[PDB]
Write a protein that binds this ligand. Structure first.
Ligand SMILES: *[C@@H]1O[C@H](CO)[C@@H](O)[C@H](O)[C@H]1NC(C)=O
Ligand SMILES: *[C@@H]1O[C@H](CO)[C@@H](O)[C@H](O)[C@H]1NC(C)=O
Ligand SMILES: *[C@@H]1O[C@H](CO)[C@@H](O)[C@H](O)[C@H]1NC(C)=O
Ligand SMILES: *[C@@H]1O[C@H](CO)[C@@H](O)[C@H](O)[C@H]1NC(C)=O
Lengths: 162, 162
């Protein structure tokens, strides 16, 4: 199985993601997204693209990406500080269940996987999440995929921020 | 007029703030909140306080505060990185109108004002906002209040983030 053959699941309407906020990453590929909270935001009233935004928040640092849909259930992200473009897909989504929300998303470079973001608001207890992680680690470079919350800084009174 | 005599307006339900996202600051007191976007977030499923969160995002830096209601329409903020507490009030709110949303919030130290955050998603065109700003600048230390968006970094394809 190669990265290009992973499922490209249908992307739920943006409000379902917004209604899932806040989410935390459970499994990621590089260290960049360890100990990270994800927030979805509707487009600004003054946005001329009317693209929503994904926020990756790690302590006091934040990466933001406006995004729009592309071919084959892709999400085309525009990293807001650089203008750098990224193409993402979802392995699966399972939003707004009785046990909350989870999803796993990935970024390929051809047959190899180069980034992975499994998110939840239920501390990784959706059986679909563990299962997707086990499939993703079988694609080339999937060996890098690992638990995102092993060594996170202590909190100071909040729950999704530190 | 002193800071303690400013209006303490009723705080709209949290969903009305969330539905206003993203907002930008129009008038602030210190430089800290210039060129800043505000995002409201519902409490995490795993939060034991069930406090929502306000996010102040300035480029790639973020301050987060969990908050709960206090006496006399106060908002009691817990800055998530330090545990430092702040007591805020709203001068007025005007959320989810035909011309979008605006509000002005302030933080006193007794009779003096020490921080001010007027937010909107309509580029400061709510007449209530200019009017509130003119009142706030008359309390002691209100002379510091000024336009928040005079020298902001260039964007790279997004609208509420840079
Ligand atoms: C994809 O692979 C090649 C290296 O083999 C590299 O030149 C290119 O920048 C890579 N792209 C990304 C987005 O990592
Ligand atoms: C979240 O899940 C991990 C196991 O993956 C567990 O060790 C940890 O204590 C759980 N956290 C909470 C808040 O229950
Ligand atoms: C309020 O005023 C005094 C200085 O006159 C200072 O000691 C105290 O820390 C101030 N509090 C805040 C929150 O600024
Ligand atoms: C926002 O308002 C200011 C005046 O306060 C104006 O100079 C600026 O061009 C406006 N921005 C947009 C995007 O219309």
């Amino acid at each position: 199985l190669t990265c290009d053959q992973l499922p490209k699941a249908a992307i739920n309407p943006i409000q379902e993601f917004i209604d899932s906020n806040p989410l935390e990453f459970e499994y990621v590929l590089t260290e960049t997204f360890e100990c990270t909270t994800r927030i979805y935001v509707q487009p600004a009233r003054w946005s001329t693209t009317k693209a929503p935004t994904a926020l990756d928040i790690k302590g006091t640092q934040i990466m933001a990406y406006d995004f729009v849909g592309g071919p084959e259930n892709s999400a085309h992200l525009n990293e807001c500080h650089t203008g750098d473009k990224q193409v993402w897909y979802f392995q699966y989504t399972n939003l707004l269940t009785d046990n909350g929300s989870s999803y796993c998303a990935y970024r390929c470079n051809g047959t190899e996987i180069i980034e992975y973001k499994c998110a939840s608001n239920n501390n990784g207890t959706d059986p679909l999440q563990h299962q997707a992680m086990e499939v993703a680690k079988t694609v080339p470079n999937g060996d890098k995929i690992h638990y995102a919350k092993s060594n996170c800084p202590e909190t100071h009174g909040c729950f999704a921020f530190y």
